[PDB]
Amino acid sequence: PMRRRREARTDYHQRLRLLKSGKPRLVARKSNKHVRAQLVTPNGDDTLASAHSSDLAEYGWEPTGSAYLTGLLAGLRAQEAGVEEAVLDIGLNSPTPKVFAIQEGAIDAGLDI
Amino acid sequence: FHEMREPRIEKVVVHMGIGHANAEDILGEITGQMPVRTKAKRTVGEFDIREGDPIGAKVTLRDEMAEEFLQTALPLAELATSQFDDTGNFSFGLDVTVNLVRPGYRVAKRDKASRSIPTKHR
Amino acid sequence: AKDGPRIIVKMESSAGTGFYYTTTKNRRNTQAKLELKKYDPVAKKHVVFREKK
Amino acid sequence: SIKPTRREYISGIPGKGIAQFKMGNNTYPAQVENVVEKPVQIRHNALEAARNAANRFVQNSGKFRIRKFPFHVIREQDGDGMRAPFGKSVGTAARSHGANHDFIAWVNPDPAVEFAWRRAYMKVTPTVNIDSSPAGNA
Amino acid sequence: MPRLKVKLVKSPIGYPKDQKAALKALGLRRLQQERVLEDTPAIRGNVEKVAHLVRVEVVE
Amino acid sequence: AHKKGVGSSKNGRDSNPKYLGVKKFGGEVVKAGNILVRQRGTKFKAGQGVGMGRDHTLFALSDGKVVFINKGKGARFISIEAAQTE
Amino acid sequence: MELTAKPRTPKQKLDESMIAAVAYNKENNVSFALDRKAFDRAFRQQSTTGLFDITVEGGETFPALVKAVQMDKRKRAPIHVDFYMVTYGEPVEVSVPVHTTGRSQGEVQGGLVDIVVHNLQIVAPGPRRIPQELVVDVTKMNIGDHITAGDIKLPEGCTLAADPELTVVSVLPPRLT
RNA sequence: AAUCCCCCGUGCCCAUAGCGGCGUGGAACCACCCGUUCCCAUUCCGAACACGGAAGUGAAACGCGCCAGCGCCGAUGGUACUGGGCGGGCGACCGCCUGGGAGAGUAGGUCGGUGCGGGGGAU
RNA sequence: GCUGACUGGGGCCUGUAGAGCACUGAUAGGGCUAGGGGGCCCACCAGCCUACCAAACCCUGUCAAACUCCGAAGGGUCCCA
RNA sequence: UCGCCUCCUAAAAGGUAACGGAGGCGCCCAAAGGUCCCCUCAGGCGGGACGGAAAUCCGCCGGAGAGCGCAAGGGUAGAAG
């Protein structure tokens, strides 16, 4: 096959799905413990720590809120940066109520999503 | 680290499958994890040619529920030798197959670095 | 086209009468009388299209 | 160098019906042997014969290993005259690639065989070269 | 800037098309005459390719 | 009123695929590269493939057209240097 | 022995009396030299089986010699060889062979005889330490009987670069059994 | 604050990263974990996807490190093929002169390297 | 009106000749092996052994325009001369 | 025997006859269509029901060799699936 293909679980490709364009893989990356999200925007882009459950201490609000806010937040540190409308990257999972969470994160953030 | 090798329930399968509609219902009452799996072939050894027919029934039960069963039914069984086989697994009754699980075990499912299960851990 | 009373018969549809129609080929094959899909007569836009003919 | 149609389509995938590869015997040293240097769709039968010929003149030790085999095929006459050629098949042969490792007479000391191959030699069809391999012959 | 002087030999008559092109190219009219060019590969190439076509001598 | 057998005798016919434009030439939102028609073009150039490496054709405008699995559904952009402020 | 030259000049050397071979030894390789003449004499004695060397500028009169060639071409007349040396306590690539004598069992009584896909052995006993002649023949020969790798029976230098169960030698019907 | 260890998400380089063999690590990390009213969810169980949390643990998937058995890569000189130019056989074809010059064949090589960020860890 | 065959350079294509085996189909000596044998307890025995046929995997070996993990010789094309 | 689809032949762009090689088509599929959501093959190995080729399930191994309506070639699981 190909590396990722003999392996599995992944679909980094639907990642590509978005890669086409629409601005940035506002990518939610999750490992229950926490979540951390970055921004891969086309052109061998980069990022800007917009959201992580450790850039501001792993509270104790667990999922629900945790994601709510860290999201809103990322959205904002970001607009500070100067973006506008970003594009949703389901790092993985079926936009799990968790992702859902990060998601409204950008949502309310204002982060157009 | 004996804190390893020494086991922990990982897959028990209970079933049946006539070339044929509800007997599997009987299953149902017996357990709680359905198993509609099409059976095959193309000849008359039982008038089984219709190459494509729902006819294989398999109530999968690992751990938990499989505990309800290992318990409830382990009594009606009566052999306890021979029907013991190699890869650390065995089977008996009108369609029963269980699989031991030494600690190397799990590695085997990985799509990645799927270690060919060292016949020294299993 | 090649009028084939074979499982291949030409047909078209109407917009509730959005007015005229549009182009389709079909098969008794499955579903007989059955034939509904939506379109856009010169009439306004969209509309319920029944296909039989 | 024209050749066959499609090895599953004109005439493709046989058994070239012949007379196998090893008769003769063992040993670690002396390479006694036969190779050639002509170029040709080596004549199935012909060959087969030649070869078993040698066999004939001998019977045992002295590697009568024979490194050849006919695997493609010729064609001609079957239908209307001379213009449009459908296709009658005959002649399974192999490209004797202008010299190469033909058939051996391998063994410690059994000139009986050597001569024998010789025989097989005179036999064969396109002149062929009479010879020795990696050390000589004894 | 080595200066190459070449003289014309063994007629084109038949000999290849493009080749004939290296000829008009270098600048090659009537027979057995001689012409000259800077080392300059380009030039150098057209002529050495037609090679045999004649003689190549070193001067300026 | 019919046809025969045991006489393969059956020519075939034409086609005309290609590497039309070839890599690194005056780019022009046009049939990019071809070996597979109902193509779904892509961005600037392509270089993924059943061999490894990658292709850069120093020419870009909107986009081009591909070859179903041959060549390479471009996407790894390269609008090329000659694409800066006039 | 001797064998010389090493500039860069093939075509002509590849002509006359000096066939060209590479001066090869882990880490370094210098332009071929040597000469089809010498070759003759010694490769003659036993290329990739015995082992001597040359004295070029006294240089490093070390052993190994050839680990690649082909008496190549059509004529069955070699040109362009591969020489390698090993002043090291690592010699592993060891190809020398083994023999029998003709143990009368299949032969001297049943006519029957043998196939020796083996003959030669590539392993690695004790470096710069291999019998220029390894003998090994537990006799035994007839019927549909066969022997190989495994059983083998190896002496001192314990290597076996090869593998069990394979191409040793067997008895076969010279006509029948 | 804008120096190195480290893990974490993670990106380029399509096996000199894969295999597997031993090993090391949990504070920190991560997973495994615990449990299942409600989100959402299995054509069958929330095994996977799941929501809510300690304790338990490094076993398991996991990260560096060691090992060449497989595996991958891979040269020098080196042969065939040949661009071109001219000679020898009625011959299939042989040869030479001038740039190009694969694989395979022994060396020998490797068990990633490198992007950006986030957590720490170095007053 | 320097834009042309051609030559130098530089990308970027083809993938015959070659060569090779893991894709495929050949294929030969061979070994492991199980299918047929085949001789032995007569033999539902499914137990025994073994010198003939074999599939398959292995080692040694080979061929291919409609095979190719390999890969030129060269031709192509844009541009720079 | 006359039209079209694939392969070789085309001497490596693209492209050439031949009464040269082989072989398919004058259909279909209202859902193999659109898109969103999830699945990761054949095959081999080992172990059990009705099963002693040839399933059904379970546990390993796997440049995907299965697969795609229909023919060849291309592709390619990241999937067309």
From Swiss-Prot, chain E:
NCBIfam families: rpmD_bact. The gene is rpmD. GO terms for molecular function: structural constituent of ribosome. GO terms for biological process: translation. It comes from the Bacteria. Pfam families: Ribosomal_L30. This is Large ribosomal subunit protein uL30. The lineage of its organism: Bacteria, Thermotogati, Deinococcota, Deinococci, Thermales. Part of the 50S ribosomal subunit. GO terms for cellular component: cytosolic large ribosomal subunit. The keyword Ribonucleoprotein applies. Keywords: Ribonucleoprotein, Ribosomal protein. CDD domains: Ribosomal_L30. InterPro entries: Ribo_uL30_ferredoxin-like_sf (IPR036919), Ribosomal_uL30_bac-type (IPR005996), Ribosomal_uL30_CS (IPR018038), Ribosomal_uL30_ferredoxin-like (IPR016082). Belongs to the universal ribosomal protein uL30 family.
